[PDB]
Design a protein around this nucleic acid. Sequence first.
RNA 1: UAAUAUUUGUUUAAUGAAAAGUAUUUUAUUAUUAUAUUGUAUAGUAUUAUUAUAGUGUAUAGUUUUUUAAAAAUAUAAAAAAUAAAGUAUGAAUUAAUAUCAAAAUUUUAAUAAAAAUUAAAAAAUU
Lengths: 216, 116, 37, 65, 48, 55, 168, 82, 52, 111
Amino acid sequence: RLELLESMRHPRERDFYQDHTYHNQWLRRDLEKHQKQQLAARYKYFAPDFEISPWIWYPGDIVEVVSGEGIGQRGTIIAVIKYKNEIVVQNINVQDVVIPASESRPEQIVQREHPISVTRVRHVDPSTNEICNIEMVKVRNKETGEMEEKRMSLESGILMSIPPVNDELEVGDPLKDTPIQDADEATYDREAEQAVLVDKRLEAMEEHFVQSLKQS
Amino acid sequence: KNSWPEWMDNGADGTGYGIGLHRTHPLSRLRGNLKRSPSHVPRVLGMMIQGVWHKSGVKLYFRGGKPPNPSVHPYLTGEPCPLYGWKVTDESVIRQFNMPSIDGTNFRYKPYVALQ
Amino acid sequence: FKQGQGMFSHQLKRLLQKKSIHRYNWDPLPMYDPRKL
Amino acid sequence: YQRGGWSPGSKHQKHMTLNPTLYLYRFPGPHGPGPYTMKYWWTLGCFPTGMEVPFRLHEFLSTYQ
Amino acid sequence: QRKLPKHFPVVQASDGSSLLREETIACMERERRLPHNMGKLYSYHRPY
Amino acid sequence: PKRKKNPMQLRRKVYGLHFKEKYLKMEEWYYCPLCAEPKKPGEWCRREDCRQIKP
Amino acid sequence: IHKGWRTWEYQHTRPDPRPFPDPPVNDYFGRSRIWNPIACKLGYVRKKADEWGWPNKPPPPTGLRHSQEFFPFFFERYFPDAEVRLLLDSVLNNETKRPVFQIPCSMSKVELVNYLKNIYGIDNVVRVEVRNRRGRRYKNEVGEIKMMDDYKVAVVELDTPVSVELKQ
Amino acid sequence: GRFNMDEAAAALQLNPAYAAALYRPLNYTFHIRGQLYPAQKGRPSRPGSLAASQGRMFPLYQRNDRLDKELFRLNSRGLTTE
Amino acid sequence: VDREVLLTGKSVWECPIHIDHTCGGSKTVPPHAKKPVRYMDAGIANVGVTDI
Amino acid sequence: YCERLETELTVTQERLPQHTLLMKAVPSSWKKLDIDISVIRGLSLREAMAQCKLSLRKGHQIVFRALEMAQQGAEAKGLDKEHLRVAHISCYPGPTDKQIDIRSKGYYAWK
RNA sequence: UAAUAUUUGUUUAAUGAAAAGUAUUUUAUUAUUAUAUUGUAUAGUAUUAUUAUAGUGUAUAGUUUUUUAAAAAUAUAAAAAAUAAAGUAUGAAUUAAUAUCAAAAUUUUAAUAAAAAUUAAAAAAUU
Ligand SMILES: [Zn+2]
């Protein structure tokens, strides 16, 4: 609306400092306080330790919604946004997403699941189908002394494994990438080059020491 | 007196050829007038803000709007002589970039490593 | 000059506040030189 | 001297040696900041005084995101 | 019991060797100047 | 001024004819038979019909 | 002290000096920014952490520290670090005899030519012109003033006009 | 059959880049302080707009150092007593 | 990344940006620093208590 | 109950044969604009636009812009152009910017 | 106070400018005869103020932002002459205990008495 804002005023009234500014604007000086509050309220996950400790929720688990809208609905965890402490649950909290117009496309209104807070969702026991309080347990993996961590339901005593992190394997750059048989060839013979290094340290150390002897 | 030679205080010639800040590779015998000591702190700033007004009507070092960093100058590699404008007294301070090539399997190496 | 609206005098009010390296240089003995005894 | 508030928005006369203030050309007022400072906001990129830190996050989320 | 305050950054290798910590810090810093990922800026003050 | 004026003193100025003639007054007009714009009689437009015959 | 103040009613704590000191850090990200010559403890201590482990490791003999083989010099000789980058708009579809490089400010006119000779194999360089341009300053959408690193603009004059062609 | 400053300079042997520099102020050719207008200074690229620099919008007002070094400041080889 | 995750539906584990919670103040602290060992601290937390 | 209340309030305001345009941050004063408004109350749209077009005042220009846009709004709503009337015109105090008026002997005031 | 004062951009000899310590030059730019390094445009006095201070060096680049349709009185110059006041736009400052106001006269009351009492006869707007 800016141009009609300037079409309604008088030509007689000047407004100075159109491209420059009396005070230098390249100093760092803080924002006014209520937009600092906007930043804080919008950006909470920048705080230290906002990530929840030994994080239980992994995609594929069946979960009830305990409080808020959709209360009492069971779903499956689709995706995990971990640093925000948020969870996408299957066909729960589904709202519209507006995909704007462009050169080739019109504006599309497209339904999508939206992230739910982790606070209000609780696991469902795969056996009993009840809400179980899950504790986190270390168990020696098969053939492995590392005792990797699984999640147990305290009521029924059931262990749930952690799924893998499998990702885009669809990315590759063959010309510019070294193959593994190439990269894993050991060229390090250490004793020889070690001898060379050590001798050429020795030379300088001796040289400065004899210079010290000189000026003494 | 002054550790740094006297040609960088007043010029090597009448037009004040060699004056300003000079930083030294600290493996090199020659020395510059960049000293971070408290007692030297006025005059280095005195170069960075003022610069110097030579009697020849030309303002040396910083005459402009962008004050020079004395810290990131390339190293002092020599001393000025009137005949050949700059004598290189030390060549070992100039970085000679040298890269080994076409040795062994080096040709097969590529900037990134592939996936499994 | 430190008094001005300029930014050089704005830096000099601030940059000159940091504290320099301190070592205790304890005084030389030019006339009694222990190393020649 | 000082027939008004000690604010840099307040109505009446001030004096420099008593109530020193720096030169704020168009200082956006107590309420709404108006169409003039917003004119400046949409043309030169910030308010004319250079003390108001340009904060556009709320429209970055609107158009580019 | 913590050996550094909770709000300190973790700058270290995965082994715990502090050998490279200055390179890591320098890297993080040049990265806070101009993040490689960074998309189009919506600011009127733009680097070019 | 020696004193704050109340809303009545502020309202006294609008009873005057000077005020009414200046501010709240409606203008008399008709439609320009050549241009179809609203027009006050005696003021014309830059158009070659409206200079010779000025309607 | 014609008259003694009542000092017995104060607990002992140092008041802040009213002409309060501003913080030593430099907030001005503009053109005229000054590098601070004054050296604090932290500089030397971080040096000492960088070069050898100072807290833990024992210091090497001085003869090593002052020699070409000492690690920051060794690694600099055999593993150099420079971003010598090219403005493409100089070498894009126009034929240009003078490509324009961005360079770390610590390089000389000689070191650039050495760089281009031994690495990129650019063997004909008539000469180099050098500007020092302060790094690019920008504000983001929160209004955080940021400054990309300072650079050196080198106009590099060749014998043979050079273009890099764009397939449309 | 007009004036044509270039052919006027060519007829006078005046170096046509110079002849034009006589008729603009010394601010726009030579390195000399002078009144500059902040709208000429140039602007970074907005979201609506492109970048604005004083290379594209004012080519003819930019400084030339051919003229500056040949006119104002001294040559060193005239003074060398070595 | 928020928009892109909302669209593609991919799960994100680590934060796409590094957050320095000291706002560049941790570089001021010397590199060898560590907190001292505090003995017999005041608190109820080291008694693990679930029900009170 | 509440969402139903606001529902019926919005729908009883909406299905009414009127168009209400609100223009914000108009660049005039309150007193001046009130003066320039009080002429136009209780007029046809025709005479409103004509009286706005025929005066030398800023307020009337602003009101002309408002009339034109509200007219486009009302036509987009499906009403008749020839029967429109200004049922309600009012001004109420908006936002403010401030400025330095410099005065001799180190005096200043805020415009 | 304030529908107020102020502002009000229809014609340039400010030629020049180091002493300014602020102003994103995206690559401002040699073709050099010279070598490395470094740096060139508008912020003095709280202002884009009355308008700078000083050292260069030169004389035909006109080197290109000042509203307006009567008269008093104020300001210049010769009570004549030149200038300025209904104006559209911007919009301060001194002042403010007040009731829609307080006009005229007479005496009185602890010192003008816009305090009393009595008689009386003050419409509105603008200058
Ligand atoms: Zn007509």
